[PDB]
Motif scaffolding. Structure first.
Motif, PDB file in Angstrom:
ATOM      1  N   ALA A   1       0.427  -0.695   0.389  1.00  0.00           N
ATOM      2  CA  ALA A   1       0.049  -0.097   0.156  1.00  0.00           C
ATOM      3  C   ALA A   1       1.052   1.358  -0.461  1.00  0.00           C
ATOM      4  O   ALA A   1       1.110   1.790   0.751  1.00  0.00           O
ATOM      5  CB  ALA A   1      -1.063  -0.207   1.185  1.00  0.00           C
ATOM      6  N   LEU A   2       1.653   1.661  -1.382  1.00  0.00           N
ATOM      7  CA  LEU A   2       2.530   2.629  -1.464  1.00  0.00           C
ATOM      8  C   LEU A   2       2.324   3.301  -2.623  1.00  0.00           C
ATOM      9  O   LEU A   2       2.867   2.713  -3.996  1.00  0.00           O
ATOM     10  CB  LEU A   2       3.867   2.285  -1.312  1.00  0.00           C
TER      11      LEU A   2
ATOM     12  N   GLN B   1      14.378   5.412  10.780  1.00  0.00           N
ATOM     13  CA  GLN B   1      13.658   4.189  11.293  1.00  0.00           C
ATOM     14  C   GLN B   1      12.783   4.406  10.127  1.00  0.00           C
ATOM     15  O   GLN B   1      11.921   4.560   9.608  1.00  0.00           O
ATOM     16  CB  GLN B   1      12.162   5.719  12.034  1.00  0.00           C
ATOM     17  N   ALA B   2      13.076   2.809  10.063  1.00  0.00           N
ATOM     18  CA  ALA B   2      11.881   2.246   8.883  1.00  0.00           C
ATOM     19  C   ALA B   2      11.186   2.422   8.028  1.00  0.00           C
ATOM     20  O   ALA B   2      10.801   3.304   6.894  1.00  0.00           O
ATOM     21  CB  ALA B   2      12.209   0.843   8.669  1.00  0.00           C
ATOM     22  N   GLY B   3       9.916   2.132   8.955  1.00  0.00           N
ATOM     23  CA  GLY B   3       8.563   2.627   8.311  1.00  0.00           C
ATOM     24  C   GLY B   3       8.250   3.491   8.338  1.00  0.00           C
ATOM     25  O   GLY B   3       7.597   3.707   7.291  1.00  0.00           O
ATOM     26  N   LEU B   4       8.566   4.573   9.353  1.00  0.00           N
ATOM     27  CA  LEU B   4       8.191   6.161   9.457  1.00  0.00           C
ATOM     28  C   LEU B   4       8.631   6.260   7.818  1.00  0.00           C
ATOM     29  O   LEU B   4       8.146   7.293   6.798  1.00  0.00           O
ATOM     30  CB  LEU B   4       8.312   6.542  10.935  1.00  0.00           C
TER      31      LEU B   4
ATOM     32  N   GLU C   1       9.377   5.560   4.914  1.00  0.00           N
ATOM     33  CA  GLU C   1       9.379   4.794   3.931  1.00  0.00           C
ATOM     34  C   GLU C   1       7.863   5.394   3.337  1.00  0.00           C
ATOM     35  O   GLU C   1       7.469   6.264   2.258  1.00  0.00           O
ATOM     36  CB  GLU C   1       9.236   3.152   3.677  1.00  0.00           C
ATOM     37  N   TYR C   2       6.862   5.911   4.307  1.00  0.00           N
ATOM     38  CA  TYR C   2       5.949   6.221   4.349  1.00  0.00           C
ATOM     39  C   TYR C   2       6.259   8.004   4.301  1.00  0.00           C
ATOM     40  O   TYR C   2       5.398   8.257   3.087  1.00  0.00           O
ATOM     41  CB  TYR C   2       4.959   6.551   5.709  1.00  0.00           C
ATOM     42  N   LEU C   3       7.033   8.569   4.662  1.00  0.00           N
ATOM     43  CA  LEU C   3       7.419  10.164   4.739  1.00  0.00           C
ATOM     44  C   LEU C   3       7.675  10.144   2.511  1.00  0.00           C
ATOM     45  O   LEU C   3       7.770  11.559   1.894  1.00  0.00           O
ATOM     46  CB  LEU C   3       8.336  10.560   5.281  1.00  0.00           C
TER      47      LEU C   3
ATOM     48  N   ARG D   1       5.097   9.741   0.724  1.00  0.00           N
ATOM     49  CA  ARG D   1       4.164  10.669   0.424  1.00  0.00           C
ATOM     50  C   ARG D   1       4.901  12.612  -0.061  1.00  0.00           C
ATOM     51  O   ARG D   1       4.221  12.831  -0.180  1.00  0.00           O
ATOM     52  CB  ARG D   1       4.147  11.052   2.312  1.00  0.00           C
ATOM     53  N   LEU D   2       5.899  12.453   0.310  1.00  0.00           N
ATOM     54  CA  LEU D   2       6.891  14.272   0.725  1.00  0.00           C
ATOM     55  C   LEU D   2       7.267  13.763  -1.513  1.00  0.00           C
ATOM     56  O   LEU D   2       7.804  14.868  -1.371  1.00  0.00           O
ATOM     57  CB  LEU D   2       7.385  14.419   1.900  1.00  0.00           C
TER      58      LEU D   2
END
Ligand SMILES: [Cl-]
Ligand SMILES: [Cl-]
Ligand SMILES: [Cl-]
Ligand SMILES: [Cl-]
Ligand SMILES: [Cl-]
Ligand SMILES: [Cl-]
Lengths: 173, 173, 173, 173, 173, 173
Positions: free
Chosen positions: B43-44, B158-161, B163-165, B168-169
């Motif tokens: 879900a990315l 911080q791996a999960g955080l 990858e999300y950033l 998103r950005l």
């Protein structure tokens, strides 16, 4: 994944993956057909365009299936794509006969998947096929049938002249 | 055909067909990458979009090669398309490393074809690659390198955080 | 009434009334979820908005069922609406898990009504569910699954920071 | 929460929750009234529309109360929603009499909450009711009174004809 | 023809031809109804218009069936069209009762064809009926039911006056 | 009715009803012709369109006659509509010959009704036919004659090729 999956059988999941393969192989066949008719010694631009457009439509069909697979929580699995059955495709008539055989094979695979979904009581799958594939396929096969009849009436008369007229006056260029 | 062909070696003709196969296989790999990142348990969306766009670009590269093959009077020959090397692609970092390896392989195949064309004194082929492929490839590899560096600085923290950033950005959604 | 009713079983009529109750109870649950996230000590506006929008969607689903009931000549019968299962809903992760459980329950009720309509040879009912509910539900559950995965990757890293980022960068505000 | 709450009694907090329940139950009653008049054997579209619009207005009243509850630092608590008092609502006259009884009950609950807020010296609550509810209610009750009088003058004359004329020439369709 | 036909039974082909006949006979009945209400001694323009519009809708239904027949490779076969069952149609109430009986007969023929298609595992036929006919029919029958109820409430009161009011204030002119 | 009827003989009334039947039967014949040319094994879209347009024109002719019948105070009476004379219509040439025979039959019926109206000193009827039918018919027959000549010059040369060219370059598609 398991987090969303609901009423989605492993048999349907596998068949959907097979159907993706069949659509991609159809797309590939149409790519070969299209570039054949763009050869300098064939040179029927309208025929080239017709098959190139079908290559795009079949690729898009595969992508819609893959999207659906993910929406249901199945897992897409890709296999080798077999090369097209011929390297050279003959005349416009030969090509259009090969295309209608291919479409009837795709249509049969759609009907078989619909029957499986009916048997497994998966109405979302059945609806999805009805709404996005079955009527498109019927319309395409009718159009190819119409083309076949017109090509046959022309090349029975006079083959080279007939093939040119069909490409100029029926197909879009 | 022979009617138009001029200064176009059989070695270049064959290599062009091989390069079409490599582009189509790259397109297929990117299709798999893209749909992996659309899984509910991955879900990315931005990552999915990035690889889907690359699948389209590589397919278009193949179509341009096939057009060129016909313009020179060569004959397109299609082979089986090997499935992608993996069924699951790991994290954004794993995926971007795999993509840059793939692009370097494509770039090497372009450079090898350019060298062949130079050796065979085929300036049209050399120009065609320079004008449509070599600079596009250099720019893409630079962009992937930039991404890799940014992903590495984020997931080291911080791996999960991280990858999300990045999704998103940096990536478009 | 009897003046228009045709091929509409009492079993389907009753199940439709039950389904209206389930949609209205879902709407009510989403109303509670939405206002929980608007509390000054929770204060996640994007989460509030997400659940408020779902409350509206479920109410609209119920109204469409009631319209259909009248179009077929059945009689709407209303029952008490049970209050939501919780007064406080925990974190964004807890809330999104509760929402996907709720949606899977609704989806199961839709599938069960479709099976009943199939068994009673009521194609209008089956079509109505396929066209207005089943695909909407699959799409919603996929979206919630995607959210769950993203929330989990964020709050595993760092819970408060993660929840804020999800609300700011994924959800609409 | 306690972080923002100021001059907001537990008695008012509880009464606001009760009033939300009463508005939602009114909304539900109006939903039943509206769909009754859409039955094929009743079939008064303007009457259906009138009550459907009131269902929406009462739901919105509840949502405004819940917003206010959070703005003051109270905690929304939801209870079961009792089903409407009737399954069938008779004639337009019967329905409009039932609606005005319902509105007078809501108005009394508003007046009782205003008196409580006055007694507890909570001017924000008193203002909120004055500004958003009390005048709306007076205007609605006047409109329903006007309707009742017109329906009575019509159905005294000739009941079926009268009910049709009212629906066609007074109510919006 | 045989060139395109796939999964299309002779039983369905024949039933489709029968259904075309039934739609055309319905169109013809509505033509008679429409011109009856345009007689100088009947003179209800809104009623005339209502039935004329239905004549057009049923003709269009037949044309869609004939298009579908050709798309599937069946062969349209036309039979005699029986004249309408009456030469004069009575009052608006008599006419609307006759129309709803006719529509229920058409609806039953649609349902019977859907059941045949289900039994023969012809999903394209089933979808086609669901998508283009079954919901249209349900909506029409509901509208006729609503009309019947309103006509009955009016002519019970005062027959001539009632019929005029219905034509003026419900039907489009 | 008798309230408006003036100078309108029973013989003319009856003949008008017969003429309506003849126009509707012509419309039906053209519907069959049109769908024949849409078969996959015939596939002449321009020919299909030509006859479909004529089906509409003849239906409209019938509706104008029925309107006139009511304007004069006659009573429309509908009879069975005989099916078309053939199930399959042969080549474009065969079809156009059949169409001109049909139009000459309609034209003769118009001329016979005009003579009756002249004999009965009914100038409104005579004018009505002159203004709305007789010149339209002459123009249509001339157009069909022109088509026949062009089809004959083409299929004498080379039948299949000729039929395609006529459909592509004369008829609208
Ligand atoms: Cl393999
Ligand atoms: Cl091979
Ligand atoms: Cl109860
Ligand atoms: Cl409780
Ligand atoms: Cl016969
Ligand atoms: Cl008869």
């Amino acid at each position: 994944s398991s987090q969303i999956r609901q009423n989605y059988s492993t048999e349907v999941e596998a068949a959907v993956n097979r159907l993706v393969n069949l659509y991609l192989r159809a797309s590939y066949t149409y790519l070969s057909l299209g570039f054949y008719f763009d050869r300098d010694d064939v040179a029927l631009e309208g025929v080239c365009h017709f098959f190139r457009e079908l290559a795009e439509e079949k690729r898009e069909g595969a992508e819609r299936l893959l999207k659906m697979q993910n929406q249901r929580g199945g897992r897409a699995l890709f296999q080798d794509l077999q090369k097209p059955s011929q390297d050279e495709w003959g005349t416009t008539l030969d090509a259009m006969k090969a295309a209608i055989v291919l479409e009837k094979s795709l249509n049969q695979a759609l009907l078989d998947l619909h029957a499986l979904g009916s048997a497994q009581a998966d109405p979302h799958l059945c609806d999805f096929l009805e709404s996005h594939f079955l009527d498109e396929e019927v319309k395409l096969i009718k159009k190819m049938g119409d083309h076949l009849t017109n090509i046959q009436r022309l090349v029975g008369s006079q083959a080279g002249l007939g093939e040119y007229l069909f490409e100029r006056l029926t197909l879009k260029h």
